[PDB]
Write a protein that binds this ligand. Structure first.
Ligand code: HEM
Ligand code: CPS
Ligand code: CPS
Ligand code: CPS
Length: 464
């Protein structure tokens, strides 16, 4: 009928360190995802692992993630991010979607979800997205060197992503793409960087103690968040004021006027939207550009579609995407082979059976969403970039085999907007450029928050 947590297989619990010893000898935390995939190959779909006192059970199969979904809490919960909450408490700001829990989370989630995860409303953003892409492409052919290579492509892809989502979120152009207008968002963006490189140092050492002792990390983290909030508020206020007498004209006013979220609540929620959006979206664009340079046949099949559905250099539109099944399949394939987010996390709020294992309340689960990419039950030749696998109707790919955006009600809220931006960015890029590999040397995926390349990506942009 049922076995329990103790009967779970898994790696040796080495004295004091647990699997931390193995990780420090297998590449470090940067390579953690390679190690977890190795473990799922050894012990199968479900296993138990300790990293110091950090004890977790890993789920690495489509059936397990289906089971977890069918039985999930009405308010699913990830691992707590203490430093962000400590800052909000200290400064009396609201929590956003990433740190909210319970009915408080559901309230904000519903309100935003009806705007963000509605195709009809999302497609309305395309004009804005195209305005930013137009500018980005213009900047691209300025940055391209002699042989079509863009120095620090990741950084530039981030500039686009930032500018794109800020137009969507704040109806403003921050001017990341035109030089001379570069030093406007400068302090805002540096504050984001400072914040990102600092909150991680307060997750082992308790944030309460950093606060009590008034450490330099606590100080830097507080200043960085202050600056982020001080930059966001006026934008949201101006947008709120602009449409205060036009119900139905703006997703943000409607939320404010009809769902009754306070301005304080909107500051936190919009802020977390932006933080979640920027790097991950740029990261995904990057990986697809890399997969394209490595698969000229797939890139050719893609070029044909773009040129077929958009003769001349016709500005892409959201409605055109309906007739580009291959474009959309390239993105899915890229996210399966080279995902941005390697895993997510859940704390169980009630006893539940997964596999033939009964897991108690309080069990921390890591959903290895990456490892799903290599299961031969769903992907024959899983090490091959083949977008075709998504288009053939003579074999079902099980939806719980492909989860780059997580699962269930607490899954990524930005899915449609991210897809829309990526789809259109691909149209603009391929339309103008051939994506060529500049070398054939090894490139590795490092876990640095998200999965990033081990080095500058060997790709060039050759004006077609
Ligand atoms: C291509 C880039 C994207 C990737 C792969 C992606 C991936 C994810 C994943 C894996 C999670 C966790 C889901 C879970 O635990 O089940 C997540 C949540 C989140 N994402 Fe995205 N992300 C994308 C872009 C976006 C964008 C465009 C936004 C903002 C519009 C966004 C905002 C959110 C927020 C706020 C959460 C938390 C939702 C909640 O707790 O209720 N992401 N992202
Ligand atoms: C990607 C970012 C930031 C990571 C980071 O520390 N960023 C600095 C990197 C510096 N680099 C030099 C590597 C590159 C800079 C390029 S730049 O163009 O700025 O020059 C990190 C920080 C907070 C992270 C989210 C939260 O946990 C909550 C949630 C948990 C789930 O489990 C997975 C999903 C989710 C939404 C997470 C996604 C992602 O993981 C986020 C956005
Ligand atoms: C689970 C806790 C936070 C929640 C908490 O306070 N637990 C008490 C519950 C009762 C958080 C805070 C510090 C986090 C680790 C570090 O970042 C280093 C490392 C980075 C890798 O990327 C993922 C693995 C690892 C080991 C992280 C695991 C986990 O995420 C930790 C333990
Ligand atoms: C006494 C000083 C605070 C005095 C101060 O402000 N000066 C900083 C000195 C440099 C504080 C700062 C950090 C504190 C430790 C942590 O709390 C963790 C742990 C909690 C246990 O419960 C008791 C033991 C232990 C090891 C604590 C001992 C002691 O309490 C420490 C050293």
């Amino acid at each position: 009928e049922t076995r329990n947590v103790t009967d779970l297989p898994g790696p040796t619990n080495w004295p004091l360190l647990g699997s931390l010893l193995e990780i420090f000898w297998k590449g470090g935390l940067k390579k953690q995802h390679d190690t977890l995939a190795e473990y799922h190959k050894k012990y199968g779909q479900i296993f138990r692992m300790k990293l110091g006192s950090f004890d977790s059970v890993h789920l690495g199969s489509p059936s397990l993630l289906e089971a977890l979904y069918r039985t999930e809490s009405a308010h699913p919960q990830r691992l707590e991010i203490k430093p962000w909450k400590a800052y909000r408490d200290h400064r009396n700001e609201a929590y956003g979607l990433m740190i909210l829990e319970g009915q408080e989370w559901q309230r904000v989630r519903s309100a935003f979800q009806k705007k963000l995860m509605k195709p009809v409303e999302i497609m309305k953003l395309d004009k804005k997205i195209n305005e930013v892409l137009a500018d980005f492409l213009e900047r691209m052919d300025e940055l391209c060197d002699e042989r079509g290579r863009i120095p620090d492509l990741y950084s530039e892809l981030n500039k686009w992503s930032f500018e794109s989502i800020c137009l969507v979120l704040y109806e403003k152009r921050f001017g990341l793409l035109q030089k001379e207008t570069e030093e406007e968002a400068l302090t805002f963006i540096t504050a984001i960087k400072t914040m990102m490189s600092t909150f991680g140092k307060m997750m082992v050492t308790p944030v309460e103690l950093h606060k009590r002792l008034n450490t330099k990390v606590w100080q830097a983290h507080t200043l960085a968040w202050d600056t982020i909030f001080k930059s966001v508020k006026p934008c949201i206020d101006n947008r709120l004021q602009r449409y205060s007498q036009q119900p139905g004209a703006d997703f943000l006013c409607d939320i404010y006027q009809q769902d009754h979220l306070s301005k304080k609540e909107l500051y936190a929620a919009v802020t977390e939207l932006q933080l979640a959006a920027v790097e991950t979206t740029a990261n995904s664009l990057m990986w697809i550009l890399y997969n394209l340079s490595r698969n000229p046949q797939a890139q050719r099949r893609l070029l044909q579609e773009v040129q077929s559905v958009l003769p001349d250099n016709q500005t892409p539109r959201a409605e055109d995407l309906r007739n580009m099944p291959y474009l959309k399949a390239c993105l899915k394939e890229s996210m399966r082979l080279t995902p941005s987010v390697p895993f997510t996390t859940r704390t169980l709020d009630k006893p539940t059976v997964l596999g033939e294992y009964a897991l108690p309340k309080g069990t921390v689960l890591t959903l290895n969403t990456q490892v799903l990419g290599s299961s031969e039950d769903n992907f024959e030749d899983s090490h091959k970039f083949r977008p075709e696998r998504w288009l053939q109707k003579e074999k079902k790919i099980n939806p719980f085999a492909h989860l780059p955006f997580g699962i269930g009600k607490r899954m990524c809220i930005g899915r449609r907007l991210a897809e829309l931006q990526l789809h259109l960015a691909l149209c603009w890029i391929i339309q103008k450029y051939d994506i060529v590999a500049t070398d054939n040397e090894p490139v590795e995926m490092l876990h640095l928050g998200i999965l990033v390349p081990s080095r500058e990506l060997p790709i060039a942009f050759r004006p077609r």
